[PDB]
């Protein structure tokens, strides 16, 4: 029952998305997950499953870089979690993101 990660932000760097968060407890690992935004209302009712960012399943820093072709042009949700190896943290706040940008 670890504390949840905080200050979740997305940015763009070259052909990559960069997801940054802040965590105060040292010696932690993180897992980054994503979801289609429309899944919270159309199926809703927990009739969906969160997915993992391809190479951010077990990151060691408070940062995650991943290619932009991980996503299509749409609206996605991102969330982060932490573990000590045994105990897992509550899930971060879900952030919404538009991959098109206009």
């Amino acid at each position, epitope marked *: 029952e670890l504390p949840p990660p905080e200050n979740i932000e997305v940015s763009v760097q070259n052909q990559n998305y960069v997801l940054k968060w802040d965590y105060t407890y040292a010696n932690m690992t993180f897992q980054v997950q994503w979801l289609h935004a429309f899944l919270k209302r*159309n199926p809703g009712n927990h009739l969906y499953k969160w997915k*993992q960012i391809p190479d951010c399943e077990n990151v060691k820093t408070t940062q995650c870089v991943f290619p932009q072709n991980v996503f299509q042009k749409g609206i996605y949700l991102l969330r982060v979690q932490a573990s000590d190896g045994n105990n897992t943290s509550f899930w971060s706040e879900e952030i919404k993101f538009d991959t098109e940008i206009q």
Partner: antibody
Framework: EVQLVESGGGLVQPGGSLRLSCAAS????????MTWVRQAPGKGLEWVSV???????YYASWAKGRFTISRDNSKNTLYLQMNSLRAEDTAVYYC?????????????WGQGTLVTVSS | AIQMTQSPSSLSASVGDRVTITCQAS??????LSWYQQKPGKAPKLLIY???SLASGVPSRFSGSRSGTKFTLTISSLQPEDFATYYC?????????????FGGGTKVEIKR
């Protein structure tokens, strides 16, 4: 009771155009990722293209130049437009529904239509 | 762009054997690998999703496992009705351009 029924396909001359269609029966077509997958004679499955719920199109590299996926929401129908067809395009073409909610896999196929590109 | 390397291309085995198909991704795709069975003259049938989750109506002899970018489909007791071609399907991220790839397939014939 949901089903995908493709039509079109048949004998088409090299360089010609063709439009495959796929009628979805029993479900709301525009709320799934819909894909075309092809199988050349005696070969494996080959992913051709996908259209998502917002209407964005994504392709395999070799298919992007000559193939166009689309859908008519007023007809509940998916389409694959094929221009400048090659003999190497001769294949069975399958309509296929991708479930992104849970599976992240293909959960429903059409029966396939044969496309023969020959003179 | 992602590629799935499936192995073996074909195999023969007796009724009751334990057979294993392997499929390696060119890069990590998390668990987003599914396994399909194609009988002669029919469309493919979904067997396994998320690397290890059996689809509805699939006998318990089919199982799936992951280890990095190497995925394994296993048939524990091969049956005569299992003659088929098996494909893996890897979807990188949300399957954008060249983000979806089938493996080459594996023909499975029963040795009698």
């Amino acid at each position: 009771e949901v089903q995908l029924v493709e039509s079109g396909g048949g004998l088409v001359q090299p360089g010609g155009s063709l439009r495959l269609s796929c009628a979805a029966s029993g479900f709301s077509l525009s709320s799934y990722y819909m894909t075309w997958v092809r199988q050349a004679p005696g070969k494996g499955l080959e992913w051709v293209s996908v259209i998502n719920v917002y209407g964005g199109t994504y392709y395999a590299s070799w298919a992007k130049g000559r193939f166009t996926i689309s859908r008519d929401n007023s007809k509940n129908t998916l389409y694959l437009q094929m221009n400048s067809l090659r003999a190497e395009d001769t294949a069975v073409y399958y309509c296929a529904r991708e479930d992104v909610a849970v599976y992240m896999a293909i959960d429903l196929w059409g029966q396939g239509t044969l496309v023969t590109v020959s003179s | 762009a992602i590629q799935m390397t499936q192995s073996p291309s074909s195999l023969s085995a007796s009724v009751g054997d334990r057979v294993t198909i392997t499929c390696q991704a060119s890069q990590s795709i998390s668990n987003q690998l599914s396994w399909y069975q194609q009988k002669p003259g029919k469309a493919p049938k979904l067997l396994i999703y998320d690397a290890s989750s059996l689809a509805s109506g699939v006998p318990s002899r089919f199982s799936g496992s992951r280890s990095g970018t190497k995925f394994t489909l296993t048939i524990s007791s091969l049956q005569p009705e299992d003659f088929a071609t098996y494909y893996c399907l890897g979807i990188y991220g949300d399957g954008a351009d060249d983000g979806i790839a089938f493996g080459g397939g594996t023909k499975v014939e029963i040795k009698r």
